């Protein structure tokens with residue numbers, strides 16, 4: 001393997017962390033290949049669930065608890081902290097909230113959250129690497145509570161970062177928010193990609209094509225697919241009651257990705273930095289409710 005930049009995996013990984021049996025588990029948690037039979041039964045389809053009132057309540061709660069756990073991780077971002085140590089704290093924080101860490105064993109993913117540094121686009125595996133001053137790191141949290149998943153991420157600065165890092169991070173956040181601002185009933189899912197690319201391109205950045213936002217509720221990934229690039233052919237039209245994520249990955253160089261030999265970590269083929277933000281949204285009559293918003297602070301962590 002020829003690495004595309006300066007990052008390398010830092011092994012060994014800690015043995016798989018157990019989740020106490022009193023915590024309710026999703027179907028794939030005990031499948032040997034981490035396959036989800038409830039998602040596989042729906043691979044056929046592009047039909048979107050209209051959430052019941054009970055489902056909405058279940059989504060509001062798991063997304064609020066997922067925000068709480070992202071904020072714990074945000075608190076830990078400084079030089080010299082390993083991404084495994086951030087994962088360990090996330091794992092205890094989910095169990096404290098009587099939730100299962102949705103990524104753990106999902107398709108045999110080995111950890112409880114994803115930590116993506118610098119040229120990593122997404123799905124980085126927490127490992128022994130201490131964070132370095134100047135890094136940008138994304139922490140991607142998903143919890144499962146009472147049958148529902150809630151998904152969100154932010155990119156953070158490690159100590160002082162360069163001007164390029166600040167611009168990439170700010171533009172990525174603005175891409176996400178301008179796409180959120182367009183959500184309301186009757187808009188096509190395929191439109192959000194136009195909005196995101198337009199703003200990335202205006203700032204000289206590119207949009208990852210290989211990874212998309214997704215419906216989420218009783219399944220971790222389900223309809224609709226929500227691409228983040230322009231002129232995509234996503235199927236579907238937003239209606240009140242729909243829940244899904246928007247999770248744009250934007251890059252300093254070109255948009256092309258590849259995957260490390262570990263089968264998970266996705267990296268820019270050119271080795272340049274990529275940043276991401278994600279929220280889980282519910283469509284309402286007046287636009288949408290950001291289920292994974294902060295309730296007690298106006299801005300994402302990188303602004304503070």
Ligand SMILES: CO[C@@H](C(=O)NC1Cc2ccccc2C1)[C@H](O)[C@@H](O)[C@H](O)/C=C/C(C)(C)C
Pocket residue numbers: 102103104106109114122123140141142151152211212213214221222247278
């Ligand atoms: C960018 O990543 C998103 C992602 O793969 N979307 C795709 C849309 C979709 C639709 C159907 C099946 C898989 C997928 C993945 C993903 O949802 C993340 O937000 C999530 O936090 C990480 C999940 C693991 C690492 C546990 C997979």
Ligand SMILES: [Mn+2]
Pocket residue numbers: 140141142151152153247278
């Ligand atoms: Mn996520």
Ligand SMILES: [Mn+2]
Pocket residue numbers: 151213214245247278
């Ligand atoms: Mn997601």
Ligand code: NA
Pocket residue numbers: 116117118119120121122136138273274275
């Ligand atoms: Na990155």
